[PDB]
C-alpha cells in the first residue's frame, strides 16, 4: 500500500498541474473546444476519484 | 473586448475590475475565484504550519496562527493545551486545500467561459443593483448561511467534543458546554458595556457559556433576519436614507469589515478566553503582571515581606491599591490591574490580591506559568528578534498576538479608507458629478457670494 | 511534521502558501500581454 | 523625440539579446569571482572573518596618527 | 568658419535624450563618482580602522547598515587626497583611512554645483525664469552646512554624517543627546517647512483632483486633459469656495499659491542649515537657564524639558565609548546614569 | 415650512460663510470644548501625576513653563485605559492631579477631527465636487489617532499617549525610539520618504509653475496681478514647464499631463503618511523596527559592531534613564 | 534545497505559460 | 458631579439625535445635480 | 532588429530575475555573515 498510495498522490499532483494549465487555456481557446470539453470532464472525474483514492488509502499508511 | 479596454468601458486598466459592475456572470466568477484564494490559503498555510510544527514546543514559539485556531475549537489537544494528536490539523488543511480547487474551478469557469451576464439565462441568478427586493433577498440568503455557520460552533461545543476552556477547574482542558447562557440580559448586556478599561465591551467575554450562548442568539437572529429580507422590501425611510448601487453596497460592506477588523485587533490583544494564552502566548497585560508575580515570588522566598515593602516612590514595591481600593501588583503594571487569567485568580479574593494567599498558597505551577509568560511577552522586532528593542540577537520570537493585532489594524485601516473612497464615489456617481464639474453648469457660479 | 507517508511532499508544502501572491502578479503579466488597454 | 532608437525597439530585438545573453552573464560571473577568489579583500583592504583581531587581543586596530596611519595599519597587519 | 568655442557649444547643446550642456562637464563626472564611490564603499570597504565597525556587504552588513564611514578623528580635516601625505598613492590604504568619505563628499559638493548650473543652463535655453535653480539652493545649504561646515567646526571629519542609512540614524540620535537639537528653534522652523510642504503638496494635488472639470466621458479622468489646452482643467472658483467654507480661508490667486509652495519648504531647509552652522560651534539651544535655576533649588519641580535632559545624559554616557573610540573612554558600571531597575 | 425642515436647510446651506452640516453639528461643540479646555489647562493647570508614582509633572505656563516646555500632561498611569470623565472624580482638585484634562481634550478632539473629515466629504457633495479631499485628510487624522489613542490602547495606558505640548512631543519621540527602534522600522522610513518627498515635490511644483508664468504685468508690479481669480485661461505654460523639467532629467521622467501630476502630488505624501501612521499603530502592539544587534560576528565569534550597534547604545541610554523612578522589575514590558 | 527551488520554478512558470500559450494560439486574452 | 453627568448625557444625546435625524432627512437629495 | 521578442515577455522574465536576486539577498540575511549565528 505504501507505493500504491504514493503513486496515487503523485498522480493527483501531476494531473492537478496539467489541469491548472489546461483548463484556462481550453476555456479561452477559440477552436478545438469540442475535444476540450471532453477532456475537462475526463480530467475532472479522474481528479475527484484520485482524491477519494488518496483519502481512503491514507488510513492504510498512517 | 466586450468592455475590456479603456475606450469602451470608461475605466483604465488599474481600475479594471470596475468594468465588471454590470457583468453579473464574470463578476460571479471574480467572487467565486476569490473565495477559492481564501480557502486555498487556509488549507496550504495549515499544512505548512503542520509540517514545521514541533509538538513539544509551545505553538507560540513557532509562528503559528492557524493551528492555534483549530486547537481552541477542541481539536488535537488535551489538558494544559498539550498536543495529543496532529491528525485533526492535517484534516482541516487538506479539506480546505481540496475545496479550493473546486471554488477555483467554478471561478475560472464563470470568469472566462460562462455567460458574461446572467439576466438573459436566469431570472433567479441575474440581478440589477437597483432592484431593492432582489438585493435584500440575496442578502437574506447569505444571512441564513452565516446563521448556520454560527450554529456549527454551538454544535461543536455542545455535541461534538466541546471547546478548549482555559478556565476549566483544576486546569485548562477541552470541555463540553451543557448550559449555554440564553438570558438576553447577559448576552445583550455585553453590548452595552463601555469599551474603556475594566469594562472592554464584548472583548471582556470571559467564559465559554456566554460565548456559546451568544452564538445561539446570533445564529437565530441571522436566520430570522434572513427570512425577513427574503419576504420584504425596504421601507420608505430606508429607501430615502441610502444610495442604491453596486459601489454603494460595496462601501457599506467595507465600513463594516473595517469595524470588525478593529474589533478583532482588540480581541486578540486583550482576550485570553477565545484566544487561549496556552496557544497564542500571553497578552501584553498578562506578561507585565506575570513579571511582578515572578519577582514577588522570588523576593518573598528570600525573606521579603511583600505587603509592607515600600518602593522608591512611596507606593508598594510589589503590592499597592487600585484607584478603587483593590489590592493589585505594583510598578508600572499598576495599569494592567484589570487583567484576569487562570494562573492568577487563585490568589485573588473579594478585596483583590489576597496577602495570606500570596504568602502561603502560591504553587510551583503558578511560578512556572508566570516565568514563562514574563519571558514570552508580546514584544519583538520585525525580523523576529524576541524582546525589547535593545535586546541582542538570540531568541527568534514574535508573539502570534502581535502578528495578528498588527496585520488586522493595518487591514482595518485601509478598509476604512476604502469605505470613504467608495462611499464618496457612490454618492457622487448617483448624483451625476463623479467625472468632474460641468463647465457650463458649475454649481458654485449659481450661488450667492459668501461675502 | 506531516505524517511520515507524506514526507516526500514536504518541499512542495513549503512553497504552496506563496501561490496566492503569484495570482496578483499574474494579473500584471496578463495585462502586459494585452498592452494595459 | 530626440533621434535615438526607442528602448522598446532595442530590448525586443534579437540582435540585442544575442549580444547581451553573452555580456550580462559574463559581467555577473566576473563580479562573483572578484569575491570568490578573495581578490575584493585585498584590493580594498577589508578584513576577512579571521583577520579583525589576533587570537588573544580584544583591542581594535584604530588609527591614531595622521601621517603614519599608513604604517600603523601596516604594523597592525604584520601583528596578525 | 565659426570658432571652436561656438562649435563645442552647438554640440554640448544638442537636443538629446540626456541633455549635456557646459554644466554637464562638471555635473556628470562628479555625480557619477559620488554615486559610484558610495556603491563601491558600501559593497566592499570596511570601517574597522577608522571606527572599529563593519560597513560593507562584503563583511555581512545589509542595505540598512552599510555605509561609507567618516575618517578617524586623528585625520582632523585632511582632504585625504589619494596622492596626499596620509595615503601616499596607496589605494588600499586610502580606502582603509576613510579616503572614500572625502571623495564622496567633495565630488558630491561639486556635483550639486553642476546640477544647479544645469538648472540655470536649461532654463535659459528653453526661455523660463530660473525658480527651480533658486529652490535648489535649499538642498545645497543643507548639504554644505551638515557635511562640510558642521565637521569643520568640530574636531574632525569623524563627526560628519557617515553615508549610510543606519549611520544617519546615529547622526540624528547624537544630535539629540549632545546638542538637544530638537529644542533648537532653527530646527523647529525646518520641521514646519518640511511638514508644511508635505501638507501643501497633498492638499494642492487633492484639491485640483477634486475640482476637475468634466472634459471627457471616461470614469478614469486623466485622458480628459491636453497639454496645449488654453483652459484651466479644474475650477479655482469652486476650490476657493470649498476651502473658504471648510477652513475659513482659501487661495484665490494661483500665482501666489505656487509661489508659496516654493517658499515654505525652501525657507524651512534654509532655517535648519542656520541652526547646524551654530551646532558646528556647539552653540546650541541646549538649556533654559530659568528652568535650571528653579529645578536645582526645587527638587519637586519637573517639566518635560527636565525629563528630556535626563534622556540626553543617558544617550551621551551609554553611546560615547563605542561612538567615540579615539577618546578611549572607560566608564565603570558604577558611574553610568540609570533609573531604578533598568 | 415647518421648523425641522428650515433647520435642516440652514444646517446644510451652501451659503453659510462657514459650512455647518450634519458632521458639523457634532464637530462644532466637540472642537470648542477641546479648545477651551486645552487653552485653560495650558495656562493654568496644576502639575499632573502622569506616571502614577506621585511625582507630578508641571505642564502649564503659570506653574513655571514656557511655550517650548509647556504641555497638557497625559492622564495617570494608575488610571490606565479607564474612562476618567470629570464626574468620576471626587473633586476638580483630584481630576486635575490625575490628568483629567488630557482625556477630555483628546476624546473631544479625535471626535471633532473625525467629523472635520466627514464635513469635507459633505461640503464636496453639496458643491458638486469630486469627493476625495477627505481621503487626503485621513492621513494626518490617522496619525493623530495613532499617537493619542491606538498607542495607548496597545501599551495599556493613556499615560503613554503623546503629550499636548512641544517638549512633551520630543519626550514621546525619544522614549518611542528606545522601546521600538522606530528609526529602523520601514513604515517610519516610508513616512520620512513621504514628508521629505512631499516637501521636495512641493518646492519642485511651485518652482516649475512659477518658472513658466505668462508675462501679463510690468516690472513695477508683482507678477501675481497677472492672474485674476476665476479667469478661464491657465496662467502658466505647462508645455514650457515640461520642456524644462524633461530636459533636467529626461523627457519621460517629466509630466505633461496636469491631472496625472496633481494626482502624484496628492498620492506621494498621503501614502507615505498612511504608512507612518501605521508604523505608530503597529509598534503599538510591539512589532518593532529591525534589530541587527550583534548580527555581524568574526571567525572566532567576536562581535563586530555595525552602525546598528551604535544606534543600540544610544537607545540603551534612553531606555535606562526614562521614567527613572517608575520601574521596579528588570524588563520594561509596556 | 534543489527540491523546493524546483517546485517553486515549475509553479512559477505555470502562470506565464498559460498566457504564452493563449497568445500563441490567438486566444481570448 | 451627578448633575454634571446628567447634563452632559442630555447635551450629548441631543446633538447625536440631530446628527442621526439630520442625515435621515433626505440627505441624498441635497446636492446641486440629480435628486 | 525589429520587435521580435515581445515586451511583455521581456518584462516578465526580467521581473522574475529581480525577484530571484533579491530573494537570494534575503536568504543571505539568515545564513553566513550577518546572520547573527
Ligand atoms: C458606527 C460607528 C460609529 C462610532 C461612534 C463612536 C462611539 C464610541 C466608541 C469608539 C471607540 C472607543 C475607544 C476605546 C477603545 C479601547 O480602549 O478598546 C479596548 C477594548 C478592550 O478593552 C479592554 O478590555 C479588556 C478585556 O479583558 C478582560 O477579560 C479577558 C477575558 O479573557 C481577560 O481575562 C483580560 O485579562 C481581562 O482584562 C479589559 O476590560 C481592559 O481593561 C480594556 O482596556 O476594545 C473594545 O472595547 C472593542 C474595540 C473598539 C475598537 C477600537 C477602535 C479604534 C479606532 C479606529 C481609529 C482609526 C481611525 C482612522 C481615522 C482616519
Ligand atoms: C482576485 C483577483 C482578481 C480576480 C478574481 C479578477 C477577475 C476578473 N477580472 Mg481583474 N484585475 C485584478 C485582479 C483580479 N481580477 C488585478 C490585480 C488587476 C490589475 C492588474 C486586474 C485588472 C483587470 C482588468 C484591466 C480587467 C479585469 C477583468 C476581469 C475579469 C475577466 C478576465 C479576463 O478576461 O481574462 C482573460 C485572461 C485569460 C483568458 C488568461 C487566463 C486567466 C485565467 C483565469 C487564469 C487562471 C489560472 C488558474 C491557475 C487556473 C486554475 C484552474 C484549475 C482550478 C482547474 C475577471 C472576472 C476584465 C473585465 O472586467 O472584463 C469584463 C478586464 O478588462 N481585471
Ligand atoms: C456562489 C457560488 C455560485 C453561484 C451563485 C452559481 C450560479 C450558477 N452557476 Mg456556478 N459554480 C460554482 C459556484 C456558483 N455558481 C462553483 C463553486 C462551481 C464548480 C463546481 C460552479 C460550476 C458551474 C458550471 C460548470 C455551470 C454553473 C452554472 C451556474 C448557473 C446554474 C446553477 C443552477 O441552476 O443550479 C441549481 C442547483 C443545483 C444544480 C443543485 C445545487 C447543488 C449544490 C452542490 C448544493 C450546495 C451545497 C452547499 C450549500 C455548499 C456550499 C459551499 C460553500 C461552503 C463554499 C448559475 C448562474 C451553469 C451555467 O452558468 O449555465 C450556462 C453551468 O454550466 N456552475
Ligand atoms: C449584513 C446584515 C444586514 C444588512 C446589510 C441589513 C440591511 C438592511 N436592513 Mg436588516 N436585519 C438584519 C441584517 C442586515 N440588514 C438582521 C440579522 C435582522 C434581524 C434582527 C434584520 C432585521 C431588520 C428589520 C426589522 C429591518 C431591517 C431593515 C434593513 C434595511 C435598513 C438598515 C438600516 O437602516 O440600518 C441602520 C440602523 C439604524 C437606522 C438605527 C439607528 C442608528 C444607531 C444609533 C446605530 C448604532 C450603532 C453603534 C455603532 C453602536 C453599536 C452597539 C449598540 C448595541 C450600543 C437594510 C436593507 C429595515 C427594512 O427596510 O426592512 C425591510 C427594517 O425595518 N432589518
Ligand atoms: C569635472 C570633473 C572633476 C572635478 C571637478 C574633480 C574634483 C576633485 N577630484 Mg576627481 N576625478 C575626475 C573628475 C573630477 N574631479 C575623473 C574623471 C576621475 C577619474 C580619472 C577623478 C578621480 C579622482 C581621484 C582618484 C581623486 C580625485 C580627487 C578630487 C579632488 C581634488 C582634485 C585636485 O586636487 O586636483 C588638482 C588639480 C587641478 C585643480 C587641475 C588644475 C589645472 C590648472 C587649471 C592648470 C595648471 C596645470 C599645470 C601648469 C601643470 C604642470 C605642473 C608641473 C609643475 C609639474 C576634487 C574634489 C581626490 C579626492 O577626491 O580626494 C579625497 C582623489 O583622490 N578625483
Ligand atoms: C570629465 C568627463 C569624463 C566629462 C564628460 C562629461 C560628459 C560629456 C559626459 C557624457 C556621458 C554621460 C552622460 C555620462 C553619465 C554619467 C552618469 C550616469 C551620471 C549619473 C548621475 C546620477 C545617477 C544622478 C541621479 C539621477 C537622478 C537625477 C534621478 C532622478 C529620479 C527622480 C526621482 C526624478 C523625479 C521624477 C518624478 C516622479 C517627477 C515628478 C515630481 C515633480 C517634479 C512634480 C512637479 C512637476 C513635474 C512636471 O513634470 C511639470 C511639467 C510640472 C509643472 C511640475 O510641477
Ligand atoms: C495546490 C497544488 C497545486 C497548485 C498550483 C497552482 C494553483 C498554481 C498557480 C500558479 C500561478 C498562479 C502562477 C503565477 C505565476 C506568476 C508569475 C511568475 C508572475 C510574475 C510577474 C512579473 C515578474 C511581472 C513583471 C512586470 C510586468 C509583467 C509588467 C510591468 C513591469 C513588471 C516588471 C512589474 C499543484 C498543481 C502544484 C499541485 C500540488 C498542489
Ligand atoms: C479570474 C482571473 C484571475 C484570477 C484567478 C484565480 C483567483 C483563480 C483561482 C484558482 C484557485 C483557487 C485554484 C486552486 C487550485 C487547487 C488545487 C489544484 C489543489 C490541489 C491539491 C492537491 C493536489 C493536494 C495534494 C496533497 C494532499 C492531498 C495531501 C497532503 C500533500 C498534498 C498537499 C501534496 C486573474 C487574477 C488571474 C486575472 C484574470 C482573471
Ligand atoms: C456572539 C457573541 C456574543 C453576542 C453577540 C451579539 C448578540 C451581537 C449583536 C450585535 C449587534 C446587534 C450589532 C448591531 C450593529 C449595528 C450597526 C453597526 C449599525 C450601524 C448603522 C449605520 C452605519 C447607520 C448609518 C446612518 C445613520 C446613522 C444616519 C442616517 C444615514 C445612515 C443610514 C447612513 C457575546 C458578545 C454575548 C459573547 C461572545 C460571542
Ligand atoms: C570610487 C572610485 C572610483 C570610481 C568607481 C566607480 C565610478 C564605481 C561605480 C560603481 C557602480 C555604478 C556600481 C553599481 C552598483 C549597483 C547596485 C548594487 C544595484 C543594486 C540594486 C538593487 C538591489 C535593486 C533593488 C530594488 C530597488 C532599488 C527598488 C525596486 C525594488 C528592488 C528591491 C528590486 C575611481 C575608479 C574613479 C577612483 C577611485 C575611487
Ligand atoms: C439613537 C438613534 C435613534 C434614531 C432611530 C432611527 C429610526 C429609523 C426610522 C426613522 C424614520 C424617519 O423617517 C424619515 O424622517 C425624516 C424626518 O423628517 C423625513 O423627513 C424629511 O425628508 C425630506 C426629503 O428630502 C427633507 O427634505 C425634509 O426636511 C424632511 O422633513 C424622511 O424623509 C423620513 O424618511
Ligand atoms: C481664561 C483662562 C485664563 C487663566 C488665567 C488664570 C489666572 C488666575 C488663577 C491664578 C492661579 C495660579 O496660581 C498658582 O498657584 C500655586 C500655589 O499652590 C503657585 O505655585 C507654583 O509656583 C511656581 C510659579 O513659577 C510654579 O513654578 C510651581 O510648579 C507651583 O508650585 C503658582 O505660582 C500660582 O500662580
Ligand atoms: C573660453 C576660451 C576663450 C575663447 S578664445 C578664442 O577662440 C576663438 C574660436 O572659438 C578664436 O577665433 C580666437 O582666435 C580665440 O581668441
Ligand atoms: Cl515595574
Ligand atoms: Cl521620560
Ligand atoms: Fe498646481
Ligand atoms: Mg521542509
Ligand atoms: Mg549572509
PDB file of N, CA and C in Angstrom, chain F residues 169-220:
ATOM      1  N   UNK F 169       6.191  66.291  23.171  1.00  0.00           N
ATOM      2  CA  UNK F 169       6.243  65.580  21.907  1.00  0.00           C
ATOM      3  C   UNK F 169       7.664  64.941  21.717  1.00  0.00           C
ATOM      4  N   UNK F 170       8.700  65.697  22.029  1.00  0.00           N
ATOM      5  CA  UNK F 170      10.090  65.211  21.903  1.00  0.00           C
ATOM      6  C   UNK F 170      10.320  64.074  22.907  1.00  0.00           C
ATOM      7  N   UNK F 171       9.766  64.203  24.135  1.00  0.00           N
ATOM      8  CA  UNK F 171       9.856  63.152  25.105  1.00  0.00           C
ATOM      9  C   UNK F 171       9.225  61.862  24.540  1.00  0.00           C
ATOM     10  N   UNK F 172       8.025  61.991  23.969  1.00  0.00           N
ATOM     11  CA  UNK F 172       7.322  60.811  23.389  1.00  0.00           C
ATOM     12  C   UNK F 172       8.196  60.156  22.264  1.00  0.00           C
ATOM     13  N   UNK F 173       8.818  60.993  21.458  1.00  0.00           N
ATOM     14  CA  UNK F 173       9.629  60.531  20.369  1.00  0.00           C
ATOM     15  C   UNK F 173      10.845  59.771  20.852  1.00  0.00           C
ATOM     16  N   UNK F 174      11.515  60.304  21.847  1.00  0.00           N
ATOM     17  CA  UNK F 174      12.780  59.671  22.350  1.00  0.00           C
ATOM     18  C   UNK F 174      12.520  58.312  23.036  1.00  0.00           C
ATOM     19  N   UNK F 175      11.492  58.280  23.882  1.00  0.00           N
ATOM     20  CA  UNK F 175      11.084  57.006  24.508  1.00  0.00           C
ATOM     21  C   UNK F 175      10.650  56.014  23.450  1.00  0.00           C
ATOM     22  N   UNK F 176       9.888  56.479  22.467  1.00  0.00           N
ATOM     23  CA  UNK F 176       9.427  55.557  21.384  1.00  0.00           C
ATOM     24  C   UNK F 176      10.645  54.902  20.670  1.00  0.00           C
ATOM     25  N   UNK F 177      11.683  55.682  20.436  1.00  0.00           N
ATOM     26  CA  UNK F 177      12.924  55.159  19.783  1.00  0.00           C
ATOM     27  C   UNK F 177      13.590  54.112  20.672  1.00  0.00           C
ATOM     28  N   UNK F 178      13.662  54.401  21.957  1.00  0.00           N
ATOM     29  CA  UNK F 178      14.170  53.427  22.941  1.00  0.00           C
ATOM     30  C   UNK F 178      13.471  52.109  22.944  1.00  0.00           C
ATOM     31  N   UNK F 179      12.130  52.155  22.873  1.00  0.00           N
ATOM     32  CA  UNK F 179      11.299  50.984  23.104  1.00  0.00           C
ATOM     33  C   UNK F 179      10.957  50.237  21.807  1.00  0.00           C
ATOM     34  N   UNK F 180      11.041  50.912  20.652  1.00  0.00           N
ATOM     35  CA  UNK F 180      10.585  50.320  19.395  1.00  0.00           C
ATOM     36  C   UNK F 180      11.592  50.350  18.279  1.00  0.00           C
ATOM     37  N   UNK F 181      12.675  51.064  18.468  1.00  0.00           N
ATOM     38  CA  UNK F 181      13.635  51.288  17.351  1.00  0.00           C
ATOM     39  C   UNK F 181      12.959  51.770  16.086  1.00  0.00           C
ATOM     40  N   UNK F 182      12.101  52.809  16.248  1.00  0.00           N
ATOM     41  CA  UNK F 182      11.316  53.325  15.155  1.00  0.00           C
ATOM     42  C   UNK F 182      12.141  53.739  13.936  1.00  0.00           C
ATOM     43  N   UNK F 183      13.359  54.277  14.119  1.00  0.00           N
ATOM     44  CA  UNK F 183      14.088  54.675  13.009  1.00  0.00           C
ATOM     45  C   UNK F 183      14.391  53.491  12.086  1.00  0.00           C
ATOM     46  N   UNK F 184      14.519  52.305  12.667  1.00  0.00           N
ATOM     47  CA  UNK F 184      14.834  51.102  11.853  1.00  0.00           C
ATOM     48  C   UNK F 184      13.558  50.369  11.340  1.00  0.00           C
ATOM     49  N   UNK F 185      12.407  51.025  11.481  1.00  0.00           N
ATOM     50  CA  UNK F 185      11.105  50.416  11.063  1.00  0.00           C
ATOM     51  C   UNK F 185      10.745  50.942   9.662  1.00  0.00           C
ATOM     52  N   UNK F 186      10.514  50.044   8.699  1.00  0.00           N
ATOM     53  CA  UNK F 186      10.332  50.550   7.317  1.00  0.00           C
ATOM     54  C   UNK F 186       9.153  51.482   7.080  1.00  0.00           C
ATOM     55  N   UNK F 187       8.090  51.370   7.885  1.00  0.00           N
ATOM     56  CA  UNK F 187       6.970  52.294   7.795  1.00  0.00           C
ATOM     57  C   UNK F 187       7.283  53.701   8.232  1.00  0.00           C
ATOM     58  N   UNK F 188       8.110  53.866   9.265  1.00  0.00           N
ATOM     59  CA  UNK F 188       8.615  55.205   9.571  1.00  0.00           C
ATOM     60  C   UNK F 188       9.497  55.687   8.425  1.00  0.00           C
ATOM     61  N   UNK F 189      10.264  54.770   7.849  1.00  0.00           N
ATOM     62  CA  UNK F 189      11.146  55.134   6.696  1.00  0.00           C
ATOM     63  C   UNK F 189      10.317  55.576   5.482  1.00  0.00           C
ATOM     64  N   UNK F 190       9.203  54.892   5.238  1.00  0.00           N
ATOM     65  CA  UNK F 190       8.218  55.347   4.268  1.00  0.00           C
ATOM     66  C   UNK F 190       7.665  56.727   4.623  1.00  0.00           C
ATOM     67  N   UNK F 191       7.411  56.974   5.911  1.00  0.00           N
ATOM     68  CA  UNK F 191       6.947  58.293   6.386  1.00  0.00           C
ATOM     69  C   UNK F 191       7.950  59.388   6.027  1.00  0.00           C
ATOM     70  N   UNK F 192       9.266  59.127   6.258  1.00  0.00           N
ATOM     71  CA  UNK F 192      10.248  60.142   6.011  1.00  0.00           C
ATOM     72  C   UNK F 192      10.293  60.385   4.513  1.00  0.00           C
ATOM     73  N   UNK F 193      10.271  59.316   3.698  1.00  0.00           N
ATOM     74  CA  UNK F 193      10.220  59.480   2.239  1.00  0.00           C
ATOM     75  C   UNK F 193       8.939  60.260   1.828  1.00  0.00           C
ATOM     76  N   UNK F 194       7.840  59.996   2.516  1.00  0.00           N
ATOM     77  CA  UNK F 194       6.678  60.793   2.275  1.00  0.00           C
ATOM     78  C   UNK F 194       6.729  62.266   2.555  1.00  0.00           C
ATOM     79  N   UNK F 195       7.313  62.662   3.705  1.00  0.00           N
ATOM     80  CA  UNK F 195       7.407  64.093   4.023  1.00  0.00           C
ATOM     81  C   UNK F 195       8.568  64.825   3.398  1.00  0.00           C
ATOM     82  N   UNK F 196       9.745  64.196   3.370  1.00  0.00           N
ATOM     83  CA  UNK F 196      10.882  64.746   2.579  1.00  0.00           C
ATOM     84  C   UNK F 196      10.505  64.818   1.109  1.00  0.00           C
ATOM     85  N   UNK F 197       9.937  63.760   0.561  1.00  0.00           N
ATOM     86  CA  UNK F 197       9.440  63.802  -0.819  1.00  0.00           C
ATOM     87  C   UNK F 197       8.249  64.794  -1.031  1.00  0.00           C
ATOM     88  N   UNK F 198       7.272  64.834  -0.128  1.00  0.00           N
ATOM     89  CA  UNK F 198       6.209  65.882  -0.232  1.00  0.00           C
ATOM     90  C   UNK F 198       6.816  67.306  -0.250  1.00  0.00           C
ATOM     91  N   UNK F 199       7.830  67.546   0.567  1.00  0.00           N
ATOM     92  CA  UNK F 199       8.468  68.860   0.583  1.00  0.00           C
ATOM     93  C   UNK F 199       9.163  69.124  -0.709  1.00  0.00           C
ATOM     94  N   UNK F 200       9.902  68.130  -1.157  1.00  0.00           N
ATOM     95  CA  UNK F 200      10.638  68.209  -2.407  1.00  0.00           C
ATOM     96  C   UNK F 200       9.665  68.473  -3.570  1.00  0.00           C
ATOM     97  N   UNK F 201       8.628  67.660  -3.710  1.00  0.00           N
ATOM     98  CA  UNK F 201       7.734  67.890  -4.839  1.00  0.00           C
ATOM     99  C   UNK F 201       6.946  69.192  -4.711  1.00  0.00           C
ATOM    100  N   UNK F 202       6.671  69.625  -3.478  1.00  0.00           N
ATOM    101  CA  UNK F 202       6.080  70.917  -3.184  1.00  0.00           C
ATOM    102  C   UNK F 202       6.928  72.014  -3.744  1.00  0.00           C
ATOM    103  N   UNK F 203       8.211  71.965  -3.444  1.00  0.00           N
ATOM    104  CA  UNK F 203       9.123  73.047  -3.942  1.00  0.00           C
ATOM    105  C   UNK F 203       9.270  72.943  -5.477  1.00  0.00           C
ATOM    106  N   UNK F 204       9.366  71.716  -5.967  1.00  0.00           N
ATOM    107  CA  UNK F 204       9.524  71.437  -7.423  1.00  0.00           C
ATOM    108  C   UNK F 204       8.320  72.021  -8.209  1.00  0.00           C
ATOM    109  N   UNK F 205       7.139  71.664  -7.791  1.00  0.00           N
ATOM    110  CA  UNK F 205       5.905  72.121  -8.481  1.00  0.00           C
ATOM    111  C   UNK F 205       5.723  73.624  -8.423  1.00  0.00           C
ATOM    112  N   UNK F 206       5.852  74.179  -7.214  1.00  0.00           N
ATOM    113  CA  UNK F 206       5.854  75.629  -7.029  1.00  0.00           C
ATOM    114  C   UNK F 206       6.850  76.284  -7.955  1.00  0.00           C
ATOM    115  N   UNK F 207       8.017  75.687  -8.056  1.00  0.00           N
ATOM    116  CA  UNK F 207       9.102  76.378  -8.809  1.00  0.00           C
ATOM    117  C   UNK F 207       8.837  76.208 -10.302  1.00  0.00           C
ATOM    118  N   UNK F 208       8.246  75.099 -10.699  1.00  0.00           N
ATOM    119  CA  UNK F 208       8.128  74.875 -12.167  1.00  0.00           C
ATOM    120  C   UNK F 208       6.997  75.736 -12.720  1.00  0.00           C
ATOM    121  N   UNK F 209       5.887  75.768 -12.008  1.00  0.00           N
ATOM    122  CA  UNK F 209       4.767  76.624 -12.400  1.00  0.00           C
ATOM    123  C   UNK F 209       5.140  78.087 -12.346  1.00  0.00           C
ATOM    124  N   UNK F 210       5.847  78.483 -11.287  1.00  0.00           N
ATOM    125  CA  UNK F 210       6.334  79.851 -11.184  1.00  0.00           C
ATOM    126  C   UNK F 210       7.326  80.196 -12.334  1.00  0.00           C
ATOM    127  N   UNK F 211       8.107  79.212 -12.783  1.00  0.00           N
ATOM    128  CA  UNK F 211       9.097  79.439 -13.832  1.00  0.00           C
ATOM    129  C   UNK F 211       8.465  79.814 -15.142  1.00  0.00           C
ATOM    130  N   UNK F 212       7.214  79.415 -15.318  1.00  0.00           N
ATOM    131  CA  UNK F 212       6.586  79.413 -16.628  1.00  0.00           C
ATOM    132  C   UNK F 212       5.330  80.276 -16.671  1.00  0.00           C
ATOM    133  N   UNK F 213       5.268  81.262 -15.773  1.00  0.00           N
ATOM    134  CA  UNK F 213       4.153  82.167 -15.717  1.00  0.00           C
ATOM    135  C   UNK F 213       4.167  82.991 -16.989  1.00  0.00           C
ATOM    136  N   UNK F 214       2.968  83.162 -17.565  1.00  0.00           N
ATOM    137  CA  UNK F 214       2.827  84.001 -18.771  1.00  0.00           C
ATOM    138  C   UNK F 214       2.965  85.497 -18.408  1.00  0.00           C
ATOM    139  N   UNK F 215       3.859  86.202 -19.108  1.00  0.00           N
ATOM    140  CA  UNK F 215       4.071  87.659 -18.949  1.00  0.00           C
ATOM    141  C   UNK F 215       2.756  88.438 -19.162  1.00  0.00           C
ATOM    142  N   UNK F 216       2.280  89.076 -18.084  1.00  0.00           N
ATOM    143  CA  UNK F 216       0.993  89.798 -18.031  1.00  0.00           C
ATOM    144  C   UNK F 216       1.073  91.071 -17.194  1.00  0.00           C
ATOM    145  N   UNK F 217       2.293  91.487 -16.825  1.00  0.00           N
ATOM    146  CA  UNK F 217       2.490  92.553 -15.836  1.00  0.00           C
ATOM    147  C   UNK F 217       3.798  93.248 -16.227  1.00  0.00           C
ATOM    148  N   UNK F 218       3.964  94.478 -15.735  1.00  0.00           N
ATOM    149  CA  UNK F 218       5.183  95.281 -15.961  1.00  0.00           C
ATOM    150  C   UNK F 218       6.152  95.016 -14.838  1.00  0.00           C
ATOM    151  N   UNK F 219       7.388  95.525 -14.977  1.00  0.00           N
ATOM    152  CA  UNK F 219       8.480  95.309 -13.969  1.00  0.00           C
ATOM    153  C   UNK F 219       8.222  95.947 -12.567  1.00  0.00           C
ATOM    154  N   UNK F 220       7.351  96.962 -12.521  1.00  0.00           N
ATOM    155  CA  UNK F 220       6.995  97.653 -11.260  1.00  0.00           C
ATOM    156  C   UNK F 220       5.721  97.095 -10.556  1.00  0.00           C
TER     157      UNK F 220
END
